[PDB]
Design a protein around this motif. Structure first.
Motif, PDB file in Angstrom:
ATOM      1  N   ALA A 112       0.808  -1.212   0.000  1.00  0.00           N
ATOM      2  CA  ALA A 112       0.000   0.000   0.000  1.00  0.00           C
ATOM      3  C   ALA A 112       0.847   1.270   0.000  1.00  0.00           C
ATOM      4  O   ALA A 112       0.536   2.215  -0.718  1.00  0.00           O
TER       5      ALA A 112
ATOM      6  N   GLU B 195      -3.127  -5.359  -6.326  1.00  0.00           N
ATOM      7  CA  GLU B 195      -3.841  -4.433  -5.452  1.00  0.00           C
ATOM      8  C   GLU B 195      -4.060  -3.096  -6.135  1.00  0.00           C
ATOM      9  O   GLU B 195      -5.091  -2.431  -5.945  1.00  0.00           O
ATOM     10  N   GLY B 196      -3.073  -2.687  -6.914  1.00  0.00           N
ATOM     11  CA  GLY B 196      -3.155  -1.433  -7.616  1.00  0.00           C
ATOM     12  C   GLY B 196      -4.249  -1.419  -8.657  1.00  0.00           C
ATOM     13  O   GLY B 196      -4.843  -0.376  -8.913  1.00  0.00           O
TER      14      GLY B 196
ATOM     15  N   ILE C 234      -7.344   1.617  -9.088  1.00  0.00           N
ATOM     16  CA  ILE C 234      -7.428   2.444 -10.286  1.00  0.00           C
ATOM     17  C   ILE C 234      -8.879   2.641 -10.687  1.00  0.00           C
ATOM     18  O   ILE C 234      -9.256   3.709 -11.188  1.00  0.00           O
TER      19      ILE C 234
HETATM   20  C1  LIG Z   1      -3.830  -1.010  -1.686  1.00  0.00           C
HETATM   21  O1  LIG Z   1      -3.114   0.107  -1.629  1.00  0.00           O
HETATM   22  C2  LIG Z   1      -3.187   0.993  -2.659  1.00  0.00           C
HETATM   23  C3  LIG Z   1      -2.444   2.134  -2.557  1.00  0.00           C
HETATM   24  C4  LIG Z   1      -2.511   3.078  -3.559  1.00  0.00           C
HETATM   25  C5  LIG Z   1      -3.312   2.942  -4.686  1.00  0.00           C
HETATM   26  C6  LIG Z   1      -4.017   1.783  -4.793  1.00  0.00           C
HETATM   27  C7  LIG Z   1      -4.003   0.812  -3.778  1.00  0.00           C
HETATM   28  O2  LIG Z   1      -4.844   1.557  -5.820  1.00  0.00           O
HETATM   29  C8  LIG Z   1      -4.476   1.943  -7.079  1.00  0.00           C
HETATM   30  C9  LIG Z   1      -3.931   3.381  -7.146  1.00  0.00           C
HETATM   31  C10 LIG Z   1      -4.980   4.380  -7.488  1.00  0.00           C
HETATM   32  N1  LIG Z   1      -4.569   5.379  -6.608  1.00  0.00           N
HETATM   33  C11 LIG Z   1      -4.528   6.724  -6.793  1.00  0.00           C
HETATM   34  O3  LIG Z   1      -4.950   7.189  -7.842  1.00  0.00           O
HETATM   35  C12 LIG Z   1      -4.013   7.353  -5.625  1.00  0.00           C
HETATM   36  C13 LIG Z   1      -3.541   6.190  -4.854  1.00  0.00           C
HETATM   37  N2  LIG Z   1      -4.080   5.007  -5.459  1.00  0.00           N
HETATM   38  C14 LIG Z   1      -3.292   3.899  -5.772  1.00  0.00           C
END
Ligand SMILES: COc1ccc2c(c1)OC[C@H]1CN3C(=O)CCN3[C@@H]21
Length: 282
Positions: free
Chosen positions: A189, A276-277, A281
């Motif tokens: 994260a 996870e990312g 999104i």
């Molecule tokens: C599980 O932890 C995360 C941490 C950051 C983010 C996660 C999961 O999802 C995807 C991107 C989309 N996003 C942004 O656009 C701002 C931060 N987050 C990112």
């Protein structure tokens, strides 16, 4: 196979080491003759990490154009990165010469200056506004403008001046300060939050030169950063996001620099980050 279920299948079968060794076996081998010349020995941190000749960054100098740095050009994703080692006492001037000549906006640092009680790179930026740095061998001046310290990373604004022409530019320094001395982070994260902060700054965008990213050798943590960024971008661009194959993307990147992703734990962590990312999104 898809990613998240290929992931659980490797966990349940405990085969991460075998998957990673396959990647090592299939990876490209290209010459690195310039890196191994005797005159460049004190320009390399590790004797087994060298840039390929075909993709190395050249300094705009006629005496010696060598730096341990590689251009990773991802054609479908339309992203480029420069991956480099942590600067050495005798290459800090070369490092900032490269930043200037390649028109980079941002520098991404994924290590601490000291880890495990040993020095992992030089202190190559100024720590106080009123104590600027001058690099006499390359004729550059570097000033700290501001610093914002957060719990997992620090962002700095820097001014780089070419003393030959008196031109100035603003460089952003993105410093991930919490990668553990051993192993990988338990959760992706904070690493993903950091990646998104670099993106939001413009430093990865086509109106600038390639971002410069480093750790100590410029292949492990640095490889994790660009692999995760490129995979997430491809999942946004394609009609079928489950077609993105992280092992194939990694082998493509290894055409441009050797050794990217140094351990099976780093490979697993990269999968976790992309998985996870992709949920955040949307
Ligand atoms: C599980 O932890 C995360 C941490 C950051 C983010 C996660 C999961 O999802 C995807 C991107 C989309 N996003 C942004 O656009 C701002 C931060 N987050 C990112």
């Amino acid at each position: 196979m898809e990613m998240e279920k290929e992931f659980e299948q490797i966990d349940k079968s405990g085969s991460w080491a075998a998957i990673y060794q396959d990647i090592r076996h299939e990876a490209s081998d290209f010459p690195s003759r310039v890196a191994k010349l005797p005159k460049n020995k004190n320009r390399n941190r590790y004797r087994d990490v060298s840039p390929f000749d075909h993709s190395r960054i050249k300094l705009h100098q006629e005496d010696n154009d060598y730096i341990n740095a590689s251009l990773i050009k991802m054609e479908e994703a339309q992203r480029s990165y420069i991956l480099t080692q942590g600067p050495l006492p005798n290459t800090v001037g070369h490092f900032w010469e490269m930043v200037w000549e390649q028109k980079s906006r941002g520098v991404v640092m994924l290590n601490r200056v000291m880890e495990k009680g040993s020095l992992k790179c030089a202190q190559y930026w100024p720590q106080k506004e009123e104590k600027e740095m001058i690099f006499e061998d390359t004729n550059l001046k570097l000033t700290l403008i501001s610093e914002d310290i957060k719990s997992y990373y620090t962002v700095r604004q820097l001014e780089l001046e070419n003393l030959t022409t008196q031109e100035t530019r603003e460089i952003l320094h993105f410093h991930y300060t919490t990668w553990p001395d051993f192993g990988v982070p338990e959760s992706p994260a904070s690493f993903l939050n950091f990646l998104f902060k670099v993106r939001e700054s413009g430093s990865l965008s086509p109106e600038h030169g390639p971002v410069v990213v480093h750790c100590s050798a410029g292949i492990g943590r640095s490889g994790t950063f660009c692999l995760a960024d490129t995979c997430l971008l491809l999942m946004d661009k394609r009609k079928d996001p489950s077609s993105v194959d992280i092992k194939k993307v990694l082998l493509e990147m290894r055409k441009f620099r050797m050794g990217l992703i140094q351990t099976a734990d780093q490979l697993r962590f990269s999968y976790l980050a992309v998985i996870e990312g992709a949920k955040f999104i949307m």
